[PDB]
Amino acid sequence: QPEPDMITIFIGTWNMGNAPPPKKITSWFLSKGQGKTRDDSADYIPHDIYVIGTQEDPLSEKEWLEILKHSLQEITSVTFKTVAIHTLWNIRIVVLAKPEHENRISHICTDNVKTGIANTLGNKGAVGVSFMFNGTSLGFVNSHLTSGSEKKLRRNQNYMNILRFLALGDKKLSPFNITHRFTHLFWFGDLNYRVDLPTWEAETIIQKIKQQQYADLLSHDQLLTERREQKVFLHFEEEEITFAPTYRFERLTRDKYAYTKQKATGMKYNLPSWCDRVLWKSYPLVHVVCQSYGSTSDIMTSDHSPVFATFEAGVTSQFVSKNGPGTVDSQGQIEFLRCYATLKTKSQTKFYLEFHSSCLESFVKSQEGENEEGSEGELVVKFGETLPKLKPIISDPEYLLDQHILISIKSSDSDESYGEGCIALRLEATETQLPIYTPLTHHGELTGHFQGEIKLQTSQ
Numbered sequence: 001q002p003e004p005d006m007i008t009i010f011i012g013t014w015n016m017g018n019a020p021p022p023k024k025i026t027s028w029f030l031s032k033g034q035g036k037t038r039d040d041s042a043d044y045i046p047h048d049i050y051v052i053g054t055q056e057d058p059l060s061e062k063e064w065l066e067i068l069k070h071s072l073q074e075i076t077s078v079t080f081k082t083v084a085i086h087t088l089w090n091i092r093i094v095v096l097a098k099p100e101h102e103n104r105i106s107h108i109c110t111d112n113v114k115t116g117i118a119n120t121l122g123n124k125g126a127v128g129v130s131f132m133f134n135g136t137s138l139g140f141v142n143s144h145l146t147s148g149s150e151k152k153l154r155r156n157q158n159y160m161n162i163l164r165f166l167a168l169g170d171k172k173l174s175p176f177n178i179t180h181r182f183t184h185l186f187w188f189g190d191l192n193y194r195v196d197l198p199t200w201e202a203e204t205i206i207q208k209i210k211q212q213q214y215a216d217l218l219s220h221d222q223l224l225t226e227r228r229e230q231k232v233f234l235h236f237e238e239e240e241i242t243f244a245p246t247y248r249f250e251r252l253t254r255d256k257y258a259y260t261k262q263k264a265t266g267m268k269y270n271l272p273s274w275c276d277r278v279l280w281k282s283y284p285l286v287h288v289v290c291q292s293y294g295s296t297s298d299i300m301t302s303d304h305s306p307v308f309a310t311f312e313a314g315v316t317s318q319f320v321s322k323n324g325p326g327t328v329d330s331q332g333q334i335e336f337l338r339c340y341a342t343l344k345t346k347s348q349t350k351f352y353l354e355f356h357s358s359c360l361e362s363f364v365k366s367q368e369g370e371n372e373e374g375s376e377g378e379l380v381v382k383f384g385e386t387l388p389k390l391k392p393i394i395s396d397p398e399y400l401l402d403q404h405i406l407i408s409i410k411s412s413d414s415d416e417s418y419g420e421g422c423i424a425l426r427l428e429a430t431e432t433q434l435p436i437y438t439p440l441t442h443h444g445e446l447t448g449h450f451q452g453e454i455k456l457q458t459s460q
């Protein structure tokens, strides 16, 4: 029974509006409704992994698990195994997998982050799950961010708190936040970004939605515009949106957007918006293809419609050779030529690098680089030919070309990371000097760049 090189992952996000679901929710898991929908010919084909994110979820974990498992059994005739479930207040994540994957999944982690302080601490934040699927690390974040059209900056701040403080994945990757710990990271939820148009334009917006003309609305979507301006979700992807805004509906129909200010809304307008979103970030040159992104039309208990997204995602096997794991394979090496970091910092400390990768027995610290001034004010940290030769555990190119090296540039004075990035070993050639590049981030904000050349020796 061969190990897979691809899996499909279903991501669902639904703000349930504190109401129990209707008796049938199978359209959600089948990616049917509006937007990029799944072909009918696939309906009986189970996804490998289903990850369900809810917000304003009134159900117990037991009640929701029973609905989800019975839903998937009805669709697929497969009884899914529960990988993980985690709830913060009314924010929940469930991970279900086909039983054949039970012995492929390990290192299951769960965590939550509460956002805000005093006033603003008490119902918003995030839950997450991570695990290994054979050789591939997967992370999943369900967040319910701050509501209200005039709070996009609060949402951005909530995002940064969540990616700093959510403790998922390999704790040995100590310089790295969740935006670097996973082969594939999926981040979804009621992100609560709105269509920023004047209140007086509400009926105009509704007209545009009825005509399925989303372009003049998406050009004012706060998540797209904040992402454009590098204020949030730097280096994440989102599929094109081709479904109607998923908020705010009258319950028990989808024929009506309820946007007018009410005591129940704190006298706020809720212009139709794409509150409910799925984004992802995968390591460079790993296969990931969005195969659906849309909203259901037939689930109407909430003032939000469910959103679905499905993905093909590349995975690797749990590789064993005669040598590693448990030793190095001297027919493998990773070398670095002409390397330098460019940093945005105004500070003057010495810097060194740390290389982290599951292809190494443990992380590697470099010597300090040589600081120079860039021609436009920048700090340039030169490593030249001084970086260590990295000794992978396995030399087979079928393993090594699928790996990645995480890089942190650290202050000698404080040992604090000033920037993190990731280099793919999926090279065009071995035993050949080739350019490498990553942006560097810290707390998910751009802090610099790392560039140079690599020379990879495999056993072939």
Ligand SMILES: Cc1cccc(C(=O)N(C)C)c1C
Pocket (backbone or CB within 6 Å): 224, 227, 228, 229, 236, 237
């Ligand atoms: C809407 C948005 C915002 C920020 C970055 C991107 C992106 O990945 N580009 C390659 C431009 C996009 C598509």
